[PDB]
């Protein structure tokens, strides 16, 4: 058929799904950022969820 044969599953899918979920009143809510690098810095520092 015309479908791709390489496809992630299992732990990759669960990790990407958890990574992109959304909560309410988590730590760091309401900030305005300059870009993705600021988000990475804030998350790896420990100042944001």
């Amino acid at each position: 058929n015309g479908e791709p044969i390489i496809v992630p599953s299992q732990d990759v899918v669960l990790g990407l799904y958890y990574m992109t979920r959304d909560c309410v009143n988590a730590k760091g809510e309401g900030m305005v950022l300059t870009g993705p690098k600021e988000a990475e810095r804030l998350y790896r520092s420990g100042l944001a969820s």
Partner: protein
């Protein structure tokens, strides 16, 4: 004996003036993580520098206010000021003034010249004037500190987050290395991007120096 492997091969790639990749080989089992995590933590949370802290605009009175004559909003102006790199030579606090009249871009080059204040990238865009008659004036506080102090914790003036450290991004990876008849060794790769105030290699030097200094009463 008490001798451990010391690396012999050091490789540096300069992607940009503010972008570096460093490779070190060979290490002993487990030492790549040990060095990389400590270096990353120090470079991320314990580096000193100068940054903008507080701003004041005569026309505006609140973060949600709207001023006629400017295409952008107050939030965008604060966001642009948040990423303005600068150096201070021999002081700790300083106030800067910006005035411009006309229609067109408003750029960091327009900042009034000072003696102990140096601009890193002059072609930095702060504002835009749609109308010829409109004009904007402001004052800027620049201080000294460490790490990253958000404005929320600090709690007609506006406060913005302060980025004292010159590090924009830092990351590392560990791979396999095989000295002859010993195929379980470490190879360390480090990726760094700074804000242009200092060179990334120079920052790595400061990080290593600080770490080696803080443990000095225990080394026998």
């Amino acid at each position: 004996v008490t001798e451990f492997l010391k690396p012999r091969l050091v490789d540096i790639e300069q992607v940009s003036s503010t972008h570096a990749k460093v490779t070190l080989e060979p290490l002993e089992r487990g030492f790549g993580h040990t060095l990389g995590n400590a270096l990353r933590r120090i470079l991320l949370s314990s580096m000193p520098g100068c940054a903008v802290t507080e701003v004041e605009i005569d026309g505006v009175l609140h973060e949600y206010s709207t001023k006629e004559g400017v295409q952008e909003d107050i939030l965008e102006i604060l966001l642009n000021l948040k990423g303005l790199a600068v150096r201070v030579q021999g002081k700790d606090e300083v106030i800067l003034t910006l005035n411009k009249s006309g229609i067109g871009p408003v750029t960091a080059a327009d900042i009034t010249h000072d003696g102990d204040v140096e601009i890193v990238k002059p072609q930095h865009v702060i504002c835009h004037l749609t109308d010829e008659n409109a004009s904007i004036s402001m004052r800027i506080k620049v201080q000294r500190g460490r790490g990253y102090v958000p404005a929320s914790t600090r709690i007609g003036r506006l406060l913005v987050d302060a980025c004292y450290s010159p590090v924009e991004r830092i990351a590392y990876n560990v791979e396999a290395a095989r000295v002859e008849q010993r195929t379980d060794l470490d190879k360390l790769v480090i990726e760094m991007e700074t804000n242009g105030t200092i060179d990334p290699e120079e920052a790595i030097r400061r990080a290593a120096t600080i770490l080696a200094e803080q443990l000095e009463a225990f080394v026998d």
